[PDB]
Amino acid sequence: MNVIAILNHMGVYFKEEPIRELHRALERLNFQIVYPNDRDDLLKLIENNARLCGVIFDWDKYNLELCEEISKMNENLPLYAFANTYSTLDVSLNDLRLQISFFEYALGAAEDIANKIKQTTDEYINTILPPLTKALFKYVREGKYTFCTPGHMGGTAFQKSPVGSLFYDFFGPNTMKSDISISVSELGSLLDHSGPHKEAEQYIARVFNADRSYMVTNGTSTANKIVGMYSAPAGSTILIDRNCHKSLTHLMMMSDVTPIYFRPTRNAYGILGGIPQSEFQHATIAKRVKETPNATWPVHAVITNSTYDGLLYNTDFIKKTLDVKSIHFDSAWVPYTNFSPIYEGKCGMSGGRVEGKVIYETQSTHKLLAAFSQASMIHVKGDVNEETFNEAYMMHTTTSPHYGIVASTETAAAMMKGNAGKRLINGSIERAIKFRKEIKRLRTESDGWFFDVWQPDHIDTTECWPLRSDSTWHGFKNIDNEHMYLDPIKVTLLTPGMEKDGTMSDFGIPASIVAKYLDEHGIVVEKTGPYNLLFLFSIGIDKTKALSLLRALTDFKRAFDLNLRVKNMLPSLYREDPEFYENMRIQELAQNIHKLIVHHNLPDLMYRAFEVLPTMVMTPYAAFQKELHGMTEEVYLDEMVGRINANMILPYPPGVPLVMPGEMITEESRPVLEFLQMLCEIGAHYPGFETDIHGAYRQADGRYTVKVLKE
Amino acid sequence: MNVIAILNHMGVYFKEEPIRELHRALERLNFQIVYPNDRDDLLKLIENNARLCGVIFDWDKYNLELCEEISKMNENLPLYAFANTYSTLDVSLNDLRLQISFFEYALGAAEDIANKIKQTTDEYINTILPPLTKALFKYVREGKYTFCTPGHMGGTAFQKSPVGSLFYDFFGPNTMKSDISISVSELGSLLDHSGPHKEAEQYIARVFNADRSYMVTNGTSTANKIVGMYSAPAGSTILIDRNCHKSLTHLMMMSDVTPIYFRPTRNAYGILGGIPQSEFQHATIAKRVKETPNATWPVHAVITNSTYDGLLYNTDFIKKTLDVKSIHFDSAWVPYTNFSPIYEGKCGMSGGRVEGKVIYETQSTHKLLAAFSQASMIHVKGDVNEETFNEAYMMHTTTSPHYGIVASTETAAAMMKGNAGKRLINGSIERAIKFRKEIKRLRTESDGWFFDVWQPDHIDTTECWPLRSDSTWHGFKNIDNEHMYLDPIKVTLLTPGMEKDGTMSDFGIPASIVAKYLDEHGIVVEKTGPYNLLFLFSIGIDKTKALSLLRALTDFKRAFDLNLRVKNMLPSLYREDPEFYENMRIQELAQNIHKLIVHHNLPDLMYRAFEVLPTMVMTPYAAFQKELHGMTEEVYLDEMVGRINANMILPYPPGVPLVMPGEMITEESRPVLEFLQMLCEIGAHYPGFETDIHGAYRQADGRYTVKVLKE
Amino acid sequence: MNVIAILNHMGVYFKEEPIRELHRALERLNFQIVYPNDRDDLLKLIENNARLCGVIFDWDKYNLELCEEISKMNENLPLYAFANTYSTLDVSLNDLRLQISFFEYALGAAEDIANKIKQTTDEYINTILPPLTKALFKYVREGKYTFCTPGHMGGTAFQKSPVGSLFYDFFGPNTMKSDISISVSELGSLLDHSGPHKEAEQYIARVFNADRSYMVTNGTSTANKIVGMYSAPAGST
């Protein structure tokens, strides 16, 4: 961060020569001096370059033109105004947050002004840095502790080895030297919540609208288990979303609780909707407590907000309606919801404290914000026992946390702080809406088929678009109004092949082929279902990546319509089986896979498998205890009716869990078995399109086995 | 790694001019050329510099002088021999592992030889790099995936923010770009054990003498919980060392198991010995199963090897003796024991497979090897259910692991691979023994008091020195022979103040004062007990740090004997309380703290508190369930007799747990209470020397509270 | 104070090329490197040059020859010893008060060792400076107070006049910027005996074998009258 912008050409030597001397003096202090041509050039320099740390300008020529715009962009950016005899302060500048230094046009003053600009740049850096990251950077620059832990000791032990020296030269001195422990006492402790760490946590809470914040260094997987072992004692009952992550069923397998499942809705595409409002009502939960054995009233409720395809709930309704004293939102896919007013009422920390309830949010800061991997946050809005929650926190946090991960968590909090965070999140939202409108325009203007967006028919406003019952774009039957909202940055593209009423088309391109093409062109699709692709427009997706995605989609359309060979169009799919894809062309492959999907009637079977539940014979805890005792055996997948499942079965598509551990398939849930058998049959035909069921094992003869409990 | 050594001055132009041309051509390829004067200069260049990647020499002048020595140092180092007409290969070179290229003395051949040296250097780098780290480096240099997770996407989202740009500029491009996920499919998956990751695990096993190896990214805490949740089902019984890390008592709090405790021994210094051999016998364990309620035969045994002060067990005796089908060694402090023959029979992976038993080792690779923090290893020698162990592995591993931590774990395995690892560990051992002998020599040659080493009277051999009953240096009463061994690199220095029979001296310096002085001089002491300091001589401690430690100890001796003021000698202790330490001198402070220790009779109380156990009223699992139900209250520390403890109480000194959750102090274990009260009384006098009992809370009036379960 | 003395010629490249790289790095950090020929040359360099702030030498070749003599000359002088594998500390070094840092003979370590030498030179300067002079120098380098007596305000009013600019260019910037008052609160007050001033007086007492010491800025002429008016009331003899 050493770029100073100098904005003028005066025409008088007594102003211009001091600026040249200042330019030379700032270059001796290792500053890069840039020279914008006018006001708009400077505004684009600031908007495009985050390492600009100062603007030098003539005050009387530019104050009324510059100060309001610069305050709207960067309110901590140091301004170096060069003043005149009759310079004054306008009343328009009183409400502006501005960092202004005043200087004079004098010969020989360049070294003093350069030192003042260097000092002010250091002040700016220390202003925008959060406390723990500031302390860590200071220690790496300054501290000289020895005889510590880690045993590499700033990376010196790496340098005594050749391969260790390659490792050191790859990562650099600052990465090794930031690998420290609590031997460095001026950074405090993560487990003690002391020193800058304590400041860090308070800082994060003030950024994220939370009463309390905890930094987790093993991901939202670990954060969910911390919250769930605090909030669910043994023998209790939890209301849990069936659209749950692997970590929540790991929590149920680890802790002796009785699960009662929220039932999500879905459409013909396999996109999961939300939990119906009737499921949050007291009578439904009381009846479900009565019908399952060994259940008391639920003490803890876990809801995934948003859904994986980007559907936000009305969390105000859940807070006023759901009569559970502990409500936990798995908010790993929406860690940005504090930083836009379009998300108000739709996140878990929105609003204020709910009386008689504690609200938890767990967020993957590394997922859709800028943090190192395994960085996560627990946000608490409500009253917890601080010592019991600290004990639950320490039973899952290591005693030697990675300080880079902690520093990245808090640096993401500092990136989202205030107007800069609002600008970043709004830029993401506007890029996502621009991409959605570009897809619709290219759908109108192209000839033949094109991709669609899963969105309302009019997206002409910047908001979370509500899912209304009178519209049929979402495909959900009898949805509640003022219930679900579409997140603008979770763009779901739809490939041809299904009609709006859930009926298959004659022409169709399965989305796996489009995903394969995009992976040939270096584009990773987050989620692929049979006719849809998910694209997350986070703060890492700039305009060039959106343009690249749009260009690759048009390239897929032209290459499909030209009917290229699979060998030249999908070379890695060709390398999957060269003697299979030697003479096949892309339209033949698309027609064949689409008619396999239509023949086996995949969307109806996928609907009916997930609209019924297997019977919970025992809890996941008891099933995992039986598995720990070795009482498991593999049976063939056709033979799993009436058998208690030991592992969780999660098919692809739709990617959400289908059978819990301890659950059994009966005649009332035979569509579960039929959908599994259909996936195993439909994946056998074409190489590169194999069956993907986590929890089922392909055998040598092509049959599939599940693992059940011995009887 | 671009340093080529050129070793000669010939005296003939037809040899010397091609070498000058080669020097110029290698400098155009960004190689640093060094010029050793003779053979020993080159040997010291290789021993001191790990980035040397090639030696250019005349073959006939230097083969018999160089090849054996270079093969004993670096078996992969590329040798560039320039050959003559009658050059030949001696029979001495047949058994040597050498990487030799042969070249000719010709004009104008410099570019071709420089390209061959560049190619051979790249081959050397790819030879010594392990597979996953190689794949990660290749992806960072080459890959161009977009629309991925993490959301910073190689650090681009960092660069859009000013504070994020400061973060990016601190860590660098390679650290951000190594933060990837399973979207990058050519590195495989950690949870699937696929791709290079699988190769990684196999690689690690071959380095660490294990049948199976698992990389853990949340530390040995998480590794212990993985192993203990696999090996201890609910309602089972575990034999567990009372000298346990708090991750193991977190495991007992999280799992419904019944603990039976191994009882360690200790001496007057508070150093813990090992578990006696009689404790591993079948009759003792059968009687202990009978005397505690709800216990079957133990299914799992956890033993901390080595102890925290560095005492290794005879693990062969434990493997042949302890009749438990699952034995787990908490080996976080000895991850280097495969790489020296002095550790054979003393680590958990030593020897071969034990029939009917599975041996686990959990190692903190970041602690005493060169890895990033939270890197840990599970080593399995025996038969496990791979699917059940994989399930228990995924219940504690995040779905988005940090790839830098995984790469550092395997890079530490590659650093320890073969003769390079043997040389690093032997260098550590020899530096530690050199330091021990230096302390003894300076003790002999100084006038007045000096520091001692806790070691045998003769350390004249490089081995793990056995603790024998006829010697009295260790202070353990009635120790078993061929049972315990002193680790040479865990140096325990002893300050004056206690006699060898456990009786206090008249003159005494408490080790807290010496630790404070060393922390003033930038030296961190790993463990401090009342008259002893622990220093770990790992691979990160080189000769300059050992010299600095020795010089700081002699400086403490002279500054103590000169009787300097606390204000000038311990400035941070002065800043703890300036009006208290204004006129106090260091000998007065040492005399006062030593006579407080002698008055309260701290070593005898600390012995008697830990030679008795509180009665286990309930398991730690049940105590934590009671705490999760809110059934806890704070009572004063004098009132905790007959009350069931909710938290673990861990005092300092000795730093090992004193009271478990669920345990109760009775009249038979009143010395536990007396030692706690003595610590709370003795810490009230001098600022900077306060009471440190984790699990007890200092109140406003100076009294201490514990948290017990309500009755 | 930026003169580092390097004392050797070893004849082995692995010890000598790191020293050349260190010499280049220290010259990048604005240090003047001098090269004494032997031990006596180094002793005369130390005795004749007060701006020498560090000695770089090989430990095994020179510890017994250098440490006692350098301790008898300058007890705070930073010594930069480069250790070998079998380097050790002699018992004759125990009573010596020495500032020794230990370094290794490695290629590419020059920038880090140069940064350590720069930090150690800063520590040495902070050690030998007294507290109020340290605070005054820190304020002149760092402080940015405004609207404060004296009216020239660090020499600001001087540069607005031609003869004032002659005065400023004669005495220099640090002479003006040190002309401050009690509006700078982190320097303390002379009349209140507060802050570094109090430390200063205590410091002077320790140096001058006095129970109490006072600083007079108007000479012994004024000091005599302070003492006499305290000690002689009216009508006394």
CSV table of N, CA and C in Angstrom, one decimal, chain A residues 23-118:
chain,number,residue,atom,x,y,z
A,23,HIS,N,7.1,14.9,-5.3
A,23,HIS,CA,7.1,13.6,-6.1
A,23,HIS,C,8.4,12.9,-5.9
A,24,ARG,N,9.5,13.6,-6.0
A,24,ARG,CA,10.9,13.0,-5.9
A,24,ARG,C,11.1,12.5,-4.5
A,25,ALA,N,10.7,13.3,-3.5
A,25,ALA,CA,10.8,12.9,-2.1
A,25,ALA,C,10.0,11.7,-1.7
A,26,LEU,N,8.8,11.6,-2.2
A,26,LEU,CA,7.9,10.5,-2.0
A,26,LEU,C,8.5,9.2,-2.7
A,27,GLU,N,9.1,9.4,-3.8
A,27,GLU,CA,9.7,8.3,-4.5
A,27,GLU,C,11.0,7.8,-3.7
A,28,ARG,N,11.7,8.7,-3.0
A,28,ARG,CA,12.7,8.2,-2.2
A,28,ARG,C,12.2,7.5,-0.9
A,29,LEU,N,11.0,7.6,-0.6
A,29,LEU,CA,10.3,6.9,0.5
A,29,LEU,C,9.6,5.7,0.0
A,30,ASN,N,9.9,5.2,-1.2
A,30,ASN,CA,9.3,4.0,-1.8
A,30,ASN,C,7.8,4.1,-1.9
A,31,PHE,N,7.3,5.2,-2.4
A,31,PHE,CA,5.9,5.4,-2.8
A,31,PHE,C,5.8,5.4,-4.3
A,32,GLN,N,4.8,4.8,-4.8
A,32,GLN,CA,4.5,4.9,-6.2
A,32,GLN,C,3.5,6.0,-6.5
A,33,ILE,N,3.9,7.0,-7.3
A,33,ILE,CA,3.1,8.2,-7.6
A,33,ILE,C,2.4,8.0,-8.9
A,34,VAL,N,1.1,8.1,-8.8
A,34,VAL,CA,0.2,8.1,-10.0
A,34,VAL,C,-0.4,9.4,-10.3
A,35,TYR,N,-0.7,9.7,-11.5
A,35,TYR,CA,-1.1,11.0,-11.9
A,35,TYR,C,-2.4,11.0,-12.7
A,36,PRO,N,-3.6,11.0,-12.0
A,36,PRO,CA,-4.8,11.0,-12.7
A,36,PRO,C,-5.0,12.3,-13.5
A,37,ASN,N,-5.8,12.2,-14.6
A,37,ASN,CA,-6.0,13.4,-15.5
A,37,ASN,C,-7.0,14.4,-15.0
A,38,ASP,N,-8.1,13.9,-14.4
A,38,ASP,CA,-9.1,14.7,-13.9
A,38,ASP,C,-9.8,14.0,-12.7
A,39,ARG,N,-11.0,14.5,-12.3
A,39,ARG,CA,-11.7,14.0,-11.2
A,39,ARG,C,-12.2,12.6,-11.4
A,40,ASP,N,-12.8,12.3,-12.5
A,40,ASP,CA,-13.3,10.9,-12.8
A,40,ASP,C,-12.2,9.9,-13.0
A,41,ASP,N,-11.1,10.3,-13.5
A,41,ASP,CA,-9.9,9.4,-13.5
A,41,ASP,C,-9.5,9.0,-12.1
A,42,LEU,N,-9.4,10.0,-11.2
A,42,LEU,CA,-9.1,9.7,-9.8
A,42,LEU,C,-10.1,8.8,-9.2
A,43,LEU,N,-11.4,9.0,-9.5
A,43,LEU,CA,-12.5,8.1,-8.9
A,43,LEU,C,-12.3,6.7,-9.4
A,44,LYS,N,-12.0,6.5,-10.7
A,44,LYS,CA,-11.8,5.2,-11.2
A,44,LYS,C,-10.5,4.6,-10.6
A,45,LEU,N,-9.5,5.4,-10.4
A,45,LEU,CA,-8.3,4.9,-9.8
A,45,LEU,C,-8.6,4.4,-8.4
A,46,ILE,N,-9.4,5.1,-7.6
A,46,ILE,CA,-9.7,4.7,-6.2
A,46,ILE,C,-10.6,3.4,-6.3
A,47,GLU,N,-11.6,3.4,-7.2
A,47,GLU,CA,-12.5,2.2,-7.2
A,47,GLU,C,-11.8,1.0,-7.7
A,48,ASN,N,-10.8,1.1,-8.5
A,48,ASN,CA,-10.1,-0.1,-9.1
A,48,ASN,C,-8.9,-0.5,-8.3
A,49,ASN,N,-8.3,0.3,-7.4
A,49,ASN,CA,-7.1,0.1,-6.7
A,49,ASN,C,-7.2,0.3,-5.2
A,50,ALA,N,-7.1,-0.8,-4.5
A,50,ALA,CA,-7.2,-0.7,-3.0
A,50,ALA,C,-5.9,-0.3,-2.3
A,51,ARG,N,-4.8,-0.3,-3.0
A,51,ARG,CA,-3.5,0.1,-2.5
A,51,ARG,C,-3.2,1.5,-2.6
A,52,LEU,N,-4.2,2.3,-3.1
A,52,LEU,CA,-4.0,3.8,-3.1
A,52,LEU,C,-4.2,4.3,-1.6
A,53,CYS,N,-3.3,5.0,-1.1
A,53,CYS,CA,-3.3,5.4,0.3
A,53,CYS,C,-3.1,6.9,0.5
A,54,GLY,N,-3.5,7.7,-0.5
A,54,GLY,CA,-3.3,9.1,-0.4
A,54,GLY,C,-3.6,9.9,-1.7
A,55,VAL,N,-4.2,11.0,-1.6
A,55,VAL,CA,-4.5,11.9,-2.7
A,55,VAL,C,-3.9,13.3,-2.4
A,56,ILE,N,-3.0,13.8,-3.3
A,56,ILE,CA,-2.5,15.1,-3.2
A,56,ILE,C,-3.1,16.0,-4.2
A,57,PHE,N,-3.7,17.1,-3.8
A,57,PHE,CA,-4.5,17.9,-4.7
A,57,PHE,C,-4.4,19.4,-4.2
A,58,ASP,N,-4.7,20.3,-5.2
A,58,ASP,CA,-4.9,21.7,-4.8
A,58,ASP,C,-6.3,21.8,-4.2
A,59,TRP,N,-6.3,22.5,-3.0
A,59,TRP,CA,-7.6,22.5,-2.3
A,59,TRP,C,-8.7,23.3,-3.0
A,60,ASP,N,-8.4,24.5,-3.4
A,60,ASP,CA,-9.4,25.4,-3.9
A,60,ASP,C,-9.9,24.9,-5.3
A,61,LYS,N,-9.1,24.2,-6.0
A,61,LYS,CA,-9.5,23.6,-7.3
A,61,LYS,C,-10.4,22.4,-7.2
A,62,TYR,N,-10.3,21.6,-6.1
A,62,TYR,CA,-10.8,20.3,-6.1
A,62,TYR,C,-11.6,19.9,-4.9
A,63,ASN,N,-11.8,20.7,-3.8
A,63,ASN,CA,-12.4,20.3,-2.6
A,63,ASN,C,-13.9,19.9,-2.9
A,64,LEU,N,-14.6,20.8,-3.5
A,64,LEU,CA,-16.0,20.7,-3.8
A,64,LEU,C,-16.3,19.6,-4.8
A,65,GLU,N,-15.3,19.2,-5.6
A,65,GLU,CA,-15.4,18.2,-6.6
A,65,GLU,C,-15.0,16.8,-6.0
A,66,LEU,N,-14.2,16.7,-5.0
A,66,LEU,CA,-13.6,15.5,-4.6
A,66,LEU,C,-14.1,15.0,-3.3
A,67,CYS,N,-14.4,15.8,-2.3
A,67,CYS,CA,-14.5,15.4,-0.9
A,67,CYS,C,-15.7,14.5,-0.7
A,68,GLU,N,-16.8,14.8,-1.3
A,68,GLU,CA,-18.0,14.0,-1.1
A,68,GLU,C,-17.9,12.7,-1.7
A,69,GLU,N,-17.4,12.6,-3.0
A,69,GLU,CA,-17.2,11.3,-3.6
A,69,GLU,C,-16.2,10.4,-2.9
A,70,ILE,N,-15.0,11.0,-2.4
A,70,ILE,CA,-14.0,10.2,-1.7
A,70,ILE,C,-14.6,9.8,-0.4
A,71,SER,N,-15.4,10.6,0.3
A,71,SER,CA,-16.1,10.1,1.5
A,71,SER,C,-17.0,9.0,1.3
A,72,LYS,N,-17.7,9.0,0.1
A,72,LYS,CA,-18.6,7.9,-0.2
A,72,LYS,C,-17.8,6.6,-0.5
A,73,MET,N,-16.6,6.8,-1.0
A,73,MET,CA,-15.9,5.5,-1.3
A,73,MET,C,-15.0,5.1,-0.1
A,74,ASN,N,-14.1,5.9,0.4
A,74,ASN,CA,-13.2,5.5,1.4
A,74,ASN,C,-13.0,6.7,2.4
A,75,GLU,N,-13.7,6.5,3.5
A,75,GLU,CA,-13.7,7.6,4.5
A,75,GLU,C,-12.5,7.7,5.4
A,76,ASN,N,-11.6,6.7,5.3
A,76,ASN,CA,-10.3,6.8,6.0
A,76,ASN,C,-9.1,7.2,5.1
A,77,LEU,N,-9.4,7.4,3.8
A,77,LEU,CA,-8.3,7.6,2.9
A,77,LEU,C,-7.7,9.0,3.2
A,78,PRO,N,-6.3,9.1,3.4
A,78,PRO,CA,-5.7,10.3,3.7
A,78,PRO,C,-5.7,11.3,2.5
A,79,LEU,N,-6.2,12.5,2.8
A,79,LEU,CA,-6.2,13.6,1.8
A,79,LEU,C,-5.2,14.6,2.1
A,80,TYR,N,-4.3,15.0,1.1
A,80,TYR,CA,-3.2,15.9,1.3
A,80,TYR,C,-3.6,17.2,0.5
A,81,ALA,N,-4.3,18.1,1.1
A,81,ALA,CA,-4.7,19.3,0.4
A,81,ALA,C,-3.6,20.4,0.5
A,82,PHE,N,-3.2,20.9,-0.6
A,82,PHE,CA,-2.3,22.1,-0.6
A,82,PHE,C,-3.1,23.4,-0.7
A,83,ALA,N,-2.9,24.2,0.3
A,83,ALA,CA,-3.8,25.3,0.6
A,83,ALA,C,-3.3,26.6,0.0
A,84,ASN,N,-4.2,27.5,-0.2
A,84,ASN,CA,-3.9,28.9,-0.7
A,84,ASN,C,-4.2,29.9,0.4
A,85,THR,N,-3.9,31.2,0.1
A,85,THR,CA,-4.1,32.3,1.0
A,85,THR,C,-5.6,32.4,1.4
A,86,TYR,N,-6.5,32.3,0.4
A,86,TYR,CA,-7.9,32.5,0.7
A,86,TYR,C,-8.7,31.2,0.7
A,87,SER,N,-8.0,30.1,0.9
A,87,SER,CA,-8.7,28.8,1.0
A,87,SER,C,-9.6,28.9,2.3
A,88,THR,N,-10.7,28.2,2.2
A,88,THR,CA,-11.7,28.1,3.3
A,88,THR,C,-12.4,26.8,3.3
A,89,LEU,N,-13.2,26.6,4.3
A,89,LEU,CA,-14.0,25.3,4.4
A,89,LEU,C,-15.5,25.6,4.1
A,90,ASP,N,-16.0,24.9,3.2
A,90,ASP,CA,-17.4,25.1,2.8
A,90,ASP,C,-18.3,24.3,3.9
A,91,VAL,N,-19.5,24.7,4.0
A,91,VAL,CA,-20.4,24.1,4.9
A,91,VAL,C,-20.9,22.7,4.4
A,92,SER,N,-20.6,22.4,3.2
A,92,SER,CA,-20.9,21.1,2.6
A,92,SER,C,-20.0,20.0,3.2
A,93,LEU,N,-18.9,20.4,3.7
A,93,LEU,CA,-17.9,19.4,4.2
A,93,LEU,C,-18.0,19.1,5.7
A,94,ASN,N,-19.0,19.7,6.4
A,94,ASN,CA,-19.1,19.5,7.8
A,94,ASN,C,-19.6,18.1,8.2
A,95,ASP,N,-20.5,17.5,7.4
A,95,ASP,CA,-21.0,16.1,7.7
A,95,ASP,C,-20.1,15.0,7.1
A,96,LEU,N,-19.1,15.4,6.3
A,96,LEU,CA,-18.3,14.4,5.6
A,96,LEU,C,-17.2,13.9,6.6
A,97,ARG,N,-17.0,12.6,6.6
A,97,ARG,CA,-15.9,11.9,7.3
A,97,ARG,C,-14.7,12.0,6.3
A,98,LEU,N,-13.7,12.9,6.7
A,98,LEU,CA,-12.6,13.1,5.8
A,98,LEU,C,-11.3,13.2,6.7
A,99,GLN,N,-10.2,12.6,6.1
A,99,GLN,CA,-8.9,12.6,6.7
A,99,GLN,C,-8.1,13.6,5.8
A,100,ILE,N,-8.0,14.9,6.3
A,100,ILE,CA,-7.4,15.9,5.5
A,100,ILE,C,-6.2,16.5,6.2
A,101,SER,N,-5.1,16.5,5.5
A,101,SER,CA,-3.9,17.3,6.0
A,101,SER,C,-3.8,18.5,5.1
A,102,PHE,N,-3.3,19.6,5.6
A,102,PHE,CA,-3.2,20.8,4.9
A,102,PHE,C,-1.7,21.2,4.8
A,103,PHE,N,-1.2,21.5,3.6
A,103,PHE,CA,0.2,21.8,3.3
A,103,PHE,C,0.3,23.1,2.6
A,104,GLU,N,1.5,23.6,2.3
A,104,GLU,CA,1.8,24.8,1.7
A,104,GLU,C,2.7,24.6,0.5
A,105,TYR,N,2.5,25.5,-0.5
A,105,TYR,CA,3.3,25.5,-1.7
A,105,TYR,C,4.6,26.2,-1.4
A,106,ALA,N,5.7,25.5,-1.0
A,106,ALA,CA,6.9,26.1,-0.7
A,106,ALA,C,8.1,25.3,-1.2
A,107,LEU,N,9.1,25.9,-1.6
A,107,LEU,CA,10.3,25.2,-2.1
A,107,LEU,C,11.1,24.7,-0.9
A,108,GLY,N,11.7,23.5,-1.0
A,108,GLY,CA,12.5,22.9,0.0
A,108,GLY,C,11.7,22.2,1.1
A,109,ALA,N,10.4,22.2,1.1
A,109,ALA,CA,9.6,21.6,2.1
A,109,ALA,C,9.3,20.1,1.8
A,110,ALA,N,9.8,19.6,0.7
A,110,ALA,CA,9.4,18.3,0.2
A,110,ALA,C,9.8,17.1,1.2
A,111,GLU,N,10.9,17.2,1.9
A,111,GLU,CA,11.3,16.1,2.8
A,111,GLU,C,10.4,16.1,4.0
A,112,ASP,N,10.0,17.3,4.6
A,112,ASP,CA,9.1,17.3,5.7
A,112,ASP,C,7.7,16.8,5.4
A,113,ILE,N,7.2,17.3,4.2
A,113,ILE,CA,5.9,16.8,3.8
A,113,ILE,C,5.9,15.3,3.4
A,114,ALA,N,7.0,14.8,2.9
A,114,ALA,CA,7.1,13.4,2.6
A,114,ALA,C,7.1,12.6,3.9
A,115,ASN,N,7.8,13.0,4.9
A,115,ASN,CA,7.8,12.4,6.2
A,115,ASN,C,6.4,12.4,6.8
A,116,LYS,N,5.7,13.5,6.7
A,116,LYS,CA,4.3,13.6,7.2
A,116,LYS,C,3.4,12.7,6.5
A,117,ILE,N,3.5,12.5,5.2
A,117,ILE,CA,2.7,11.6,4.4
A,117,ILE,C,3.0,10.2,4.8
A,118,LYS,N,4.3,9.9,5.0
A,118,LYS,CA,4.7,8.5,5.5
A,118,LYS,C,4.1,8.2,6.8
